[PDB]
Amino acid sequence: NKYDPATIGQAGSFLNSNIREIVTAKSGFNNTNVSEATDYSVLENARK
């Protein structure tokens, strides 16, 4: 799909470079109906 992390914001993707930052995580989507708990979720020091 257009959520490919290898094609972030190249020509027609739905993700901007801001998807890489936690501060602008929601600004990193080119879509409209995006929510912080349904579409995505951010962690800041997630442990593997």
């Binding site: 936690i22 501060v23 602008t24 929510s35 708990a37 951010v42 962690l43 800041e44 020091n45």
Partner: protein, 288 residues
């Protein structure tokens, strides 16, 4: 203790003394350990509270207000700028956000542990509050109160270091600046050792969602059983006071049923994830 006539922390209202005090709020919030209310079957919020219109230190009969509770996903960005402020990452030699984000210096690094070191100079440079400024550079942000000693209104004073009655000694006990002194023998004894972070549930992430349920009780002189979630009233006739006198008391039990919210803010539909609890007083005219 709620002072509607006193300016709150990080408040920069140019006209606060002329504003109607009933339009202000004073609130606290907390993280719940168990967030699954459906599995835990959390039925209600029960509190025994003391009627503030009966005893010796009674409020005026016209000082009526509301206490709101909120349960759910509450934005823990206390200073709303989109960035998490942790004060163990501040200092003169640290990297800050290149433009100041509307509330003060915020560290540009990534937090690892929410803990200060034990160097008193670092502690003085770091324990400066949620503003990120050490009460000397606060006036640049909080222009309307730059002439005061504490422009942001967030300095911490120890209760044994203050003056007046018991209530006045605790008036500034919740300030976020200077409340983590290294030594326990300092005249302003700490009251905590953790940095003040915009992350309440300690999962390293600053939430920004606002999907919660809102409940409220009225605080009025003549509250009676059967309404306002009042389920019980215990009237204490004569209590022996330490000064040799006697006073009357009125304890009121509220049971707010979680299952019947008065309002819904945001897009929340179930109690399967209730991560935060907030309560704030509003609508009062005088100290309550």
């Amino acid at each position: 203790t709620y002072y509607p006539g006193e300016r709150g922390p990080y408040n920069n209202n140019p006209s606060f003394g002329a504003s109607n005090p009933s339009a202000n709020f004073g609130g606290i919030m907390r993280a719940l350990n168990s967030t699954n209310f459906e599995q835990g079957n959390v039925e209600y919020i029960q509190f025994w509270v003391l009627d503030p219109y009966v005893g010796n230190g009674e409020s005026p009969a016209t000082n009526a207000g509301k206490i709101y509770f909120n349960l759910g996903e509450i934005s823990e960005d206390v200073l709303k700028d989109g960035r998490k402020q942790y004060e163990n990452g501040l200092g003169p030699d640290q990297v800050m956000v290149n433009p100041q984000p509307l509330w003060g210096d915020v560290p540009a690094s990534q937090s690892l542990i929410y803990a200060f070191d034990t160097n008193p100079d670092n502690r003085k440079n770091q324990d400066v509050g949620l503003d990120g400024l050490p009460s000397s550079r606060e006036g640049s942000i909080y222009t309307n109160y730059a002439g005061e000693a504490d422009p942001a209104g967030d300095d911490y004073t120890y209760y044994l270091n203050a003056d007046g009655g018991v209530l006045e000694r605790y008036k500034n006990y919740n300030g976020t600046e200077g409340n983590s002194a290294v030594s326990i023998n300092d005249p302003n004894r700490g009251s905590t050792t953790l940095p003040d972070v915009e992350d309440i549930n300690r999962d390293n992430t600053m939430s920004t969602i606002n999907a919660y349920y809102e409940y409220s009780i009225d605080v009025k002189p003549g509250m009676q059983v059967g309404e306002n979630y009042i389920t019980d009233i215990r009237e204490v006739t004569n209590v022996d006071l330490p000064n040799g006198g006697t006073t009357n008391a009125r304890w009121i039990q509220f049971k707010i049923p979680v299952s019947q919210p008065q309002n819904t803010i945001g897009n929340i539909t179930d109690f399967r994830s209730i991560r935060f609890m907030r309560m704030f007083m509003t609508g009062f005219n005088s100290q309550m």
